[PDB]
Protein backbone atom coordinates (compact mmCIF):
# COMPACT_ATOMS: atom_id res chain seq x y z
CA UNK A 1 0.00 0.00 0.00
CA UNK A 2 2.11 2.91 1.29
CA UNK A 3 5.93 2.54 1.02
CA UNK A 4 8.14 3.56 3.95
CA UNK A 5 11.84 3.73 4.70
CA UNK A 6 13.75 3.44 7.94
CA UNK A 7 17.11 5.16 8.29
CA UNK A 8 19.05 3.83 11.27
CA UNK A 9 22.24 5.16 12.81
CA UNK A 10 23.82 8.13 14.58
CA UNK A 11 21.31 10.80 15.66
CA UNK A 12 23.63 13.63 14.54
CA UNK A 13 24.07 12.07 11.10
CA UNK A 14 20.29 11.63 10.90
CA UNK A 15 19.76 15.28 11.86
CA UNK A 16 22.10 16.35 9.05
CA UNK A 17 20.26 14.12 6.55
CA UNK A 18 16.88 15.52 7.57
CA UNK A 19 18.37 18.96 6.98
CA UNK A 20 19.54 17.96 3.50
CA UNK A 21 16.23 16.19 2.75
CA UNK A 22 14.46 19.55 2.92
CA UNK A 23 16.15 20.34 -0.41
CA UNK A 24 14.22 17.46 -1.98
CA UNK A 25 10.88 18.03 -0.24
CA UNK A 26 8.94 16.72 -3.24
CA UNK A 27 10.64 13.32 -3.08
CA UNK A 28 8.85 12.14 0.09
CA UNK A 29 5.46 12.57 1.76
CA UNK A 30 6.54 12.84 5.40
CA UNK A 31 9.57 12.43 7.65
CA UNK A 32 9.43 11.55 11.34
CA UNK A 33 11.19 12.94 14.37
CA UNK A 34 14.10 10.83 15.62
CA UNK A 35 13.01 7.87 17.71
CA UNK A 36 14.53 4.75 19.25
CA UNK A 37 13.66 1.34 20.64
CA UNK A 38 12.46 1.80 24.22
CA UNK A 39 18.39 6.33 16.47
CA UNK A 40 15.86 5.93 13.69
CA UNK A 41 13.94 8.14 11.27
CA UNK A 42 10.89 7.01 9.26
CA UNK A 43 9.80 8.29 5.84
CA UNK A 44 6.65 7.63 3.81
CA UNK A 45 6.09 8.09 0.08
CA UNK A 46 3.16 8.21 -2.34
CA UNK A 47 4.58 5.35 -4.41
CA UNK A 48 7.52 3.04 -5.04
CA UNK A 49 8.52 5.34 -7.87
CA UNK A 50 8.75 8.35 -5.55
CA UNK A 51 10.70 6.26 -3.04
CA UNK A 52 13.19 5.29 -5.73
CA UNK A 53 13.45 8.88 -6.99
CA UNK A 54 14.34 9.81 -3.41
CA UNK A 55 16.96 7.07 -3.04
CA UNK A 56 18.47 7.90 -6.42
CA UNK A 57 18.70 11.62 -5.56
CA UNK A 58 19.97 11.68 -1.98
CA UNK A 59 23.42 10.42 -1.02
CA UNK A 60 23.14 8.37 2.16
CA UNK A 61 26.31 7.63 4.18
CA UNK A 62 27.50 4.02 4.22
CA UNK A 63 27.32 4.19 8.02
CA UNK A 64 23.55 4.59 7.87
CA UNK A 65 21.41 1.46 7.53
CA UNK A 66 18.53 1.79 5.06
CA UNK A 67 15.48 -0.45 5.31
CA UNK A 68 12.36 -0.55 3.16
CA UNK A 69 8.86 -1.77 3.87
CA UNK A 70 5.18 -1.08 3.35
CA UNK A 71 2.32 -0.01 5.60
CA UNK A 72 -1.10 -1.52 4.92
CA UNK B 1 9.80 -10.32 6.42
CA UNK B 2 9.41 -8.67 9.83
CA UNK B 3 5.86 -7.58 10.85
CA UNK B 4 5.32 -4.17 12.48
CA UNK B 5 2.42 -2.22 13.91
CA UNK B 6 1.80 1.49 14.20
CA UNK B 7 -0.41 2.80 16.98
CA UNK B 8 -1.51 6.38 16.32
CA UNK B 9 -3.29 8.78 18.64
CA UNK B 10 -3.03 10.70 21.90
CA UNK B 11 0.45 10.60 23.48
CA UNK B 12 -0.99 10.08 26.98
CA UNK B 13 -3.12 7.16 25.81
CA UNK B 14 -0.05 5.72 24.07
CA UNK B 15 2.00 6.10 27.26
CA UNK B 16 -0.67 4.17 29.18
CA UNK B 17 -0.71 1.41 26.54
CA UNK B 18 3.07 1.08 26.62
CA UNK B 19 2.75 0.71 30.38
CA UNK B 20 0.16 -2.04 29.98
CA UNK B 21 2.17 -3.72 27.18
CA UNK B 22 4.92 -4.47 29.70
CA UNK B 23 2.55 -7.08 31.15
CA UNK B 24 2.69 -8.94 27.82
CA UNK B 25 6.40 -8.51 27.12
CA UNK B 26 6.59 -11.86 25.32
CA UNK B 27 4.00 -10.81 22.73
CA UNK B 28 6.27 -8.35 20.88
CA UNK B 29 9.96 -7.98 20.03
CA UNK B 30 10.39 -4.24 20.54
CA UNK B 31 8.41 -1.06 21.14
CA UNK B 32 9.54 2.42 20.15
CA UNK B 33 9.54 5.73 21.96
CA UNK B 34 6.74 8.09 20.97
CA UNK B 35 7.40 9.95 17.74
CA UNK B 36 5.56 12.20 15.30
CA UNK B 37 5.65 13.53 11.76
CA UNK B 38 8.10 16.42 11.64
CA UNK B 39 1.76 10.78 18.24
CA UNK B 40 2.85 7.35 17.07
CA UNK B 41 4.42 4.23 18.55
CA UNK B 42 5.98 1.41 16.49
CA UNK B 43 6.16 -2.29 17.42
CA UNK B 44 7.96 -5.20 15.76
CA UNK B 45 7.29 -8.92 16.13
CA UNK B 46 9.03 -12.20 15.30
CA UNK B 47 6.08 -13.38 13.18
CA UNK B 48 2.52 -12.74 12.09
CA UNK B 49 1.43 -15.26 14.69
CA UNK B 50 3.08 -13.30 17.51
CA UNK B 51 1.55 -10.09 16.15
CA UNK B 52 -1.91 -11.66 16.21
CA UNK B 53 -1.35 -13.08 19.71
CA UNK B 54 -0.54 -9.52 20.76
CA UNK B 55 -3.63 -8.02 19.11
CA UNK B 56 -5.85 -10.75 20.55
CA UNK B 57 -4.47 -10.21 24.07
CA UNK B 58 -4.30 -6.43 24.45
CA UNK B 59 -7.39 -4.24 24.46
CA UNK B 60 -6.73 -1.17 22.33
CA UNK B 61 -9.03 1.87 22.69
CA UNK B 62 -11.29 2.65 19.73
CA UNK B 63 -9.73 6.13 19.69
CA UNK B 64 -6.37 4.66 18.74
CA UNK B 65 -5.70 3.91 15.07
CA UNK B 66 -3.94 0.59 14.45
CA UNK B 67 -1.96 -0.02 11.26
CA UNK B 68 -0.04 -3.08 10.15
CA UNK B 69 2.84 -3.51 7.75
CA UNK B 70 6.11 -5.31 7.12
CA UNK B 71 9.75 -4.28 7.02
CA UNK B 72 11.98 -5.95 4.44
Swiss-Prot record, chains A, B:
Effect caused by changing residue 8 to R: Complete loss of sumoylation
Cross-link (Glycyl lysine isopeptide (Lys-Gly) (interchain with G-Cter in SUMO)): 8
Subcellular localization, as worded in the UniProt entry: Host nucleus
Region (DNA-binding domain): 1-72
The record's account of how the chain is modified after translation: Phosphorylated.
Protein origin, superkingdom: Viruses
Quaternary context: Binds DNA as homodimer. Interacts with protein E1; this interaction greatly increases E1 DNA-binding activity. Interacts with protein L1; this interaction enhances E2-dependent replication and transcription activation. Interacts with protein L2; this interaction inhibits E2 transcriptional activity but not DNA replication function E2. Interacts with protein E7; this interaction inhibits E7 oncogenic activity. Interacts with host TAF1; this interaction modulates E2-dependent transcriptional regulation. Interacts with host BRD4; this interaction mediates E2 transcriptional activation function.
Similarity field: Belongs to the papillomaviridae E2 protein family.
Note: HPV16, in comparison to HPV types 6 and 11, is more often associated with malignant genital cancers in humans.
Full protein name: Regulatory protein E2
Native source species: Human papillomavirus type 16
Whole sequence portion shown: 285 to 364 of 365
